[PDB]
Symmetry: C5
């Protein structure tokens, strides 16, 4: 079985990114673990979250019958192409908290779920009130337009089922709606997923 | 002997990770050096510990008689596969405080003991009291279920034998119980080792 | 299509400019936010996007020879990129976006890294109606105007993404094309000067 | 086109194990002090921003411009070449580089490298809030080479203050870069930056 | 003469570089000494203290031996620490990753001895209580190989005294005493004994 897995990986590794004629659908979903801190002197808020990314490539397909019934495998994210999904309003480089390892399945679908800590632009005024503070952060491909990476979601709600119950901040709502925007630099429209979080001091 | 060691290393390096058909047992244990800080403005606590990891691979076996009676060697952890054991509630990238070097023994067993500083989600309310504060952080594989990586411990007690005697925080209790969790949704069993620390000023 | 793109990239894969092959580099700033202003050290921190454009003959192709591919994306480390540097930073610049460029069939490259910069700036007056004014120059570290001809498309900094709830509001943001020369020597050193007037 | 081809050819033709007692290298140092960012009296650390000019010359980097289309100099990554190990003796944090790591090589074989850096070094800022000010010093020299191997020179005793930030928290009263030798048979040279400054 | 010396050095380096670590049958002696430059700060809110020091490391390998006559009488040379094996001497009680302050360059001598002296800033567990009193505070920090036992790396000192001759005269903290003593310790993880050099510093404001 180990020999079969090594052979399968060797065959697969022995993708130039999407194109307008071969666009890629990337599904995005956010799980918000915690709101670590809010800095009212700089309007920066720190969040810990899991960013679930899923896409499918014909080049990553295989027949499990030809490889000892291997249905899927784990591999370093550096072994494959991954989408350049970026927070648009970070104020510090995003910090990764989990192994960079993807799960590839025989139908060519890949699931990547890195855990990260992000500092982003957010005014926490009103967090010390019952109505709380509201902030947003956009996520999208930095360089690929809607014609190359089509960006989708499975749900309009951020997954709060793992939110740290003793966080300094409690979540009032958290949504993840898709938006289409045009930037001054380029004519083509760029899709994005915007996380809108309403939160308050616990 | 030096030539024998280089030959052994060359032969060994000239593993794809575990599978359901070829699963791997990883033994985990913690030595808690110190609780550096507790931050009640963010509910983050910072620990320094040694994370001892042990596992064993047939592909790393050899006969000492074939290599000058060498029974073990040291090698960079980048030369070998290592398990993806991760703290599930960290708030900052773990900081490595020791060389990334493993010890490999002729029976194929590997011993890795990185020293790290970890910031994790923890409410320190009560740390300034007699009963102290309590916090917990789960360790496990990020991508492997128990059908691929099985977790074991040699003991459910954290090694406190070198805990810093003049730390700002004294340890009331520290355990590393192992839990096998089966979700209602799926057949696979997920195992974790949970560090539970009770401490006070 | 994917095979055509791979063949094009292999075919394509520049020593940098010289006095006899000068390269025009166009610079433009999008100012996202003024994160902080530290009156104890006179340092101000900005987040901005630095749009860089240039064009190389060695990056041209005919889309008809490559399945009508007119552009592609590639890692910035696959290609030469200009050494544009803030001249009064006080900390290493921190990169906030993927280091990926857009190459177009006419040989033009577009690269827009997002960065956080700490630079020398006295914010005195930021708590008044007139606000504070600070400036920072951007330009090549090692190339004179004979090798890298630095240009702007406009002097108006793009404020369309400026963070509306920043601690600081922008009174004006201007990007000037400026150069310094020595009478003794022919060489001219150009820079783009970012001047920001802002207040609490 | 011809210039690009010639540059590529020149770089290939050219692509040094460092100096020795029998092949000593002159390294010329100069400082431009851009700013004194901060002074921390709780730890006696001061933070400076400066440009450190380094120049040296190697026979192995010479060429005839006539053979390469009148190319008289070129730019190259500092990792493509040997660089002197000049270091600050009293730094309290790793020096942070603020500029591209790129050097200029000229056809006579001389190399010029001017990294911009932010440095935290040991310094008692006592007096900085007075008319007389504070005075601090930091020595620069090779970590591993003696004066028999790296002959450390300057073009001037004066730190270049023509770019000092006019609105710094700290104004400069004087800034010198005098040379010093220490004998313990080798002689060990340094260049000492001495800054006298005040709020 | 300069051309010949350069050629000789290049040839020597090429021959030398064209070591898998010590073994029980081929143990390595590593000599350690410390120079304490400054005690940058004491944090009583976390019991962390920050030190700047130089760590002098010396060892000797047969594979780095050469004849000076063979290569223009070249007694020694400088080379990047990345070109050679170096020992994994680690601070046992750091609270932050150690920060390197100097070039990583070693001096290799024709008898195969290496000398490597990185300058580092270290944050280590240390309670500074009493630093504001005449007796001062006292802290220790163990150094040793992380992974090689006494049977593979034998750890020695040249002296019991930490070199204070470069200590920063205007530090916030003055040194009352500083010693470096060797100890042999048994750890729970392994049967074999592991040696260490412990730095014991008494200091005050
Ligand atoms: O670098 C590129 C490359 C292509 C397009 C863009 N940029 C970066 C910004 C964020 N994404 C949309 C737009 C502006
Ligand atoms: O990683 C190893 C490998 C071998 C032995 C040890 N460890 C690390 C700790 C520090 N050194 C002694 C002991 C415990």
């Amino acid at each position: 079985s180990q020999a079969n897995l090594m052979r399968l990986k060797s065959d697969l590794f022995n993708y130039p990114g999407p194109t307008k004629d071969d666009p890629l659908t990337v599904t995005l979903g956010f799980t918000l673990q915690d709101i670590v801190k809010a800095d009212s002197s700089t309007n920066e808020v720190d969040l810990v979250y899991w960013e679930q990314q899923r896409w499918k490539l014909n080049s990553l397909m295989w027949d499990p019958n030809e490889y000892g019934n291997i249905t899927d495998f784990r591999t370093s994210a550096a072994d494959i192409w991954t989408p350049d999904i970026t927070a648009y309003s970070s104020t510090r480089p995003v910090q990764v908290l989990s192994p960079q390892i993807a799960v590839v399945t025989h139908d060519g679908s890949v699931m990547f779920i890195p855990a990260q800590r992000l500092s982003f632009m957010c005014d926490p005024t009103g967090v010390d009130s019952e109505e709380g503070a509201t902030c947003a952060v956009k996520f999208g491909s930095w360089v690929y337009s809607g014609f190359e990476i089509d960006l989708k979601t499975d749900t309009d709600q951020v997954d709060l089922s793992s939110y740290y119950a003793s966080s300094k901040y409690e979540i009032l709502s958290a949504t993840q709606y898709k938006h289409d925007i045009k930037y001054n630099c380029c004519e083509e429209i760029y899709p994005d997923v915007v996380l809108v979080v309403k939160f308050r001091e616990r």
